[PDB]
């Protein structure tokens, strides 16, 4: 593994969110700025196949401070605390190159009025639904068209702080200000059903959280679990959310990112004739500004929690192929962790993840 730390030339601005979409890692933040880097350019620089002086975003444009970015190969969903835009046609489908903003179609999808604020935006590509969490309801919109499908109303005392996508598309999970984990069954139509309410389970702080569950959808990770002062823990979605493993004790009140790699890896132990399949989690250790990468099978870190930033990590995103981790903080420095086969082994075909979901 190589760590490339690349200070951004963005003056006094801040990057709050990022997303790996298509060939790009897309950064977005204050002043409405969006900047797109080719993932492979950063990886190639990390392995010295190209030089550092050539690094530069392929496309930058300006949309309010941006806190949310998600989407697919046809639409970027870009959100402030009060507005959500859709930028469609952002990727030239014939060349796999990002278009300039001048070829992009942009639409104001949603606006809320203070005191309301958007606490999270999550996109479930299998349901075809975007979830907009507001401080107190969850709104369900059809993707692209953005027709309103339904609305989940929850208690006045329960602010929905963050949402967690189910890779199988059967559920949506919310963590609340009054310490609950709420699990809803969701249908593609937008109809919904509360199926699990776990109370006094998590301590949420007034932050934008970035949490993803395991690609097999069997583990829900929790920052600041107050079951099993507080710790980062893994809950078994198939065994009544029992704690299966604790990763960090104590967790930091400033930790807001815990994301699984989408890959399911197999690494042989050739000397002993055996092999191990495992998942990877990126989060922080007890100190803000650390990055910890955790092998869920060995239940060990890949390396000592590494102090990379003087400030809390704002967001992290794995590459789609599982071999690169991108991270950003208020230090305005893009962190690229570029793994190799000799580090991790081989990402398994999606058949193997799909078999474990069923």
């Amino acid at each position: 593994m190589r760590l490339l730390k690349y200070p951004l030339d963005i003056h006094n601005e801040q990057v709050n969110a990022l997303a790996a979409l298509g060939p790009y890692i897309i950064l977005a933040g204050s002043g409405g700025h969006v900047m797109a880097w080719r993932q492979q350019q950063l990886v190639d620089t990390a392995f010295d196949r190209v030089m550092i002086k050539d690094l530069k975003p392929e496309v930058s444009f300006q949309v309010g401070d941006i806190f949310f970015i998600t989407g697919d190969l046809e639409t970027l969903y870009i959100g402030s605390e009060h507005r959500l835009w859709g930028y469609s046609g952002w990727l030239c489908r014939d060349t796999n190159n990002i278009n300039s903003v001048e070829k992009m179609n942009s639409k104001l999808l949603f606006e809320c009025k203070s005191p309301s604020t958007i606490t999270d935006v999550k996109y479930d590509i299998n349901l075809g639904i975007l979830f907009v969490l507001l401080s107190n309801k969850i709104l369900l919109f059809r993707h692209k068209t953005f027709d309103k499908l339904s609305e989940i109303t929850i208690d006045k005392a329960s602010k929905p702080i963050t949402g967690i996508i189910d890779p199988t598309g059967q559920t949506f999970t919310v963590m609340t200000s009054d310490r609950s984990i709420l699990v809803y069954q969701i249908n593609k139509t937008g109809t919904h059903k509360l199926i699990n309410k776990l109370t006094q389970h998590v301590q949420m702080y007034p932050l934008h959280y970035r949490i993803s569950m395991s690609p097999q959808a069997d583990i829900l990770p929790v920052i600041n679990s107050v079951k099993g002062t507080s710790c980062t823990a893994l809950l078994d979605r198939n065994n009544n959310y029992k704690v299966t493993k604790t990763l960090v004790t104590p967790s930091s009140n400033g930790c807001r990112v815990l994301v699984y790699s989408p890959a399911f890896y197999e690494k042989p132990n050739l000397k002993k004739g055996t092999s191990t399949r495992y998942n990877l989690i990126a989060t922080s250790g007890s100190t803000d500004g650390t990055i910890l990468v955790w092998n869920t099978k060995r239940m060990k870190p890949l390396f000592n929690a590494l102090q990379v930033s003087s400030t809390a990590i704002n967001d992290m995103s794995w590459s789609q192929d599982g071999f690169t981790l991108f991270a950003i903080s208020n230090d305005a420095t893009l962190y690229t962790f570029a793994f190799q086969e000799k580090d991790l082994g081989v990402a398994l075909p999606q058949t193997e993840i799909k078999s474990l979901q069923e």
Binding site: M1, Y6, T45, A46, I52, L55, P301, F303, D343
Partner: peptide, 11 residues
């Protein structure tokens, strides 16, 4: 401001 590029050995 210059980039840092470091090798990080794994366990």
């Amino acid at each position: 401001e210059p980039s840092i590029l470091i090798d990080v050995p794994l366990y």
